A paper describes a structure:
Here we present the structure of a nemFABP, As-p18, from A. suum, a close relative of the large intestinal roundworm of humans, Ascaris lumbricoides. The nemFABPs as a subfamily of iLBPs therefore appear to be confined to nematodes, and are distinguished by being structurally distinct, secreted from cells by a conventional (secretory leader peptide-mediated) pathway, and may be associated with particular functions in nematode reproduction and development. We find that this protein, and probably all nemFABPs, has a fold similar to that of other iLBPs, but that it possesses two extended loops so far found definitively only in nemFABPs, with the largest of these loops being remote from the presumed portal of entry for ligands and the binding site itself. The NMR and X-ray-derived structures of As-p18 agree closely (RMSD = 0.46 Å) and exhibit features that characterize the FABP family, namely the β-clamshell structure comprising 10 antiparallel β-strands capped by a helix-turn-helix section.
Using a micro-focus beamline, a dataset was collected with diffraction observed to beyond 2.2 Å. Due to clear evidence of radiation damage, the data were processed and scaled to a maximum resolution of 2.3 Å. As-p18 crystalized with two near-identical copies of the protein in the asymmetric unit (coordinate RMSD 0.19 Å for all equivalent heavy atoms), but with incomplete electron density in the ligand-binding pockets. In the crystal structure of As-p18, the electron density associated with the co-purifying ligand was of insufficient resolution to determine its conformation unambiguously. The electron density within the binding pocket indicates that a single resident fatty acid molecule could be in a U-shaped conformation as observed for other FABPs, and sit with its charged head group either buried within the protein’s binding pocket, or pointing out towards the pocket’s opening. The head group buried orientation is the more likely given the precedence set by other FABPs and our NMR data. Since As- p18 predominantly co-purifies with vaccenate, we fitted this ligand into both copies of the protein in the asymmetric unit. In E. coli, these are principally 18:1 and for As-p18 almost exclusively vaccenate (cis-11-octadecenoate). In both the NMR- and X-ray-derived structures, the N-terminal residues Asp5-Phe7 form a 310- helical loop that is an extra secondary structure element characteristic of the subfamily IV in mammalian FABPs. The βB-βC loop is poorly defined in solution, consistent with the high crystallographic B factor values for this region, but there is limited evidence for flexibility from the 15N relaxation data.
Author numbering: -5 to 143
Write the structure that this text describes.
């Protein structure tokens, strides 16, 4: 049962979401330290995000995939507020935690294993048929729009 201590992911966040457009992603990637070549390939790559109830059938456990033009990530059987270690899109190991700030806000925090000082949180919000991913680095903000499929 899902009403005994673990958080439930609102249905709002379940499904397939395809990257359609973004705002200020280039200056954000620049603040993060990416040179021109890397920024072009990062910002113009196709992204499909998938969030589902865990295929294993464990209640309040989830699966999420980041499917891109090149690298894909597959995070299986995670729980909200529970940290796990896995390979991220940069092909390195990260400590990841998905959590709920409130029923309308999903967070995703990454800590680099080889750089524990590198800590970053991504925020997801639903806005109509869109999942909006928000990020901020050194005062530079960006929003990426994923159309629910
Ligand atoms: C997240 C940073 C990735 C750095 C390494 C990228 C390597 C090869 C090019 C792949 C470009 C497509 C992925 C762009 C990142 C999408 C981020 C997201 O939607 O979570």
């Amino acid at each position: 049962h899902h009403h005994h201590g673990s958080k439930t992911l609102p249905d709002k966040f379940l499904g397939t979401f395809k990257l359609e457009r973004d705002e200020n992603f280039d200056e954000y990637l620049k603040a993060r330290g990416y040179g021109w070549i890397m920024r072009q390939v990062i910002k113009l790559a196709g992204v499909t995000k998938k969030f589902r109830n865990a295929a294993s059938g464990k209640p309040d456990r989830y699966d999420m995939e980041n499917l891109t033009t090149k690298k894909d990530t597959h995070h299986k059987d995670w729980a909200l507020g529970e940290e796990f270690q896995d390979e991220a899109l940069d092909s390195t190991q990260h400590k990841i935690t998905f959590d709920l700030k409130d029923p309308n806000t999903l967070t995703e925090t990454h800590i680099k294993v080889d750089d524990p000082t590198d800590v970053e949180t991504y925020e997801y919000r639903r806005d109509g048929d869109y999942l909006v991913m928000k990020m901020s680095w050194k005062g530079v903000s960006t929003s990426r729009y994923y159309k629910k499929q």
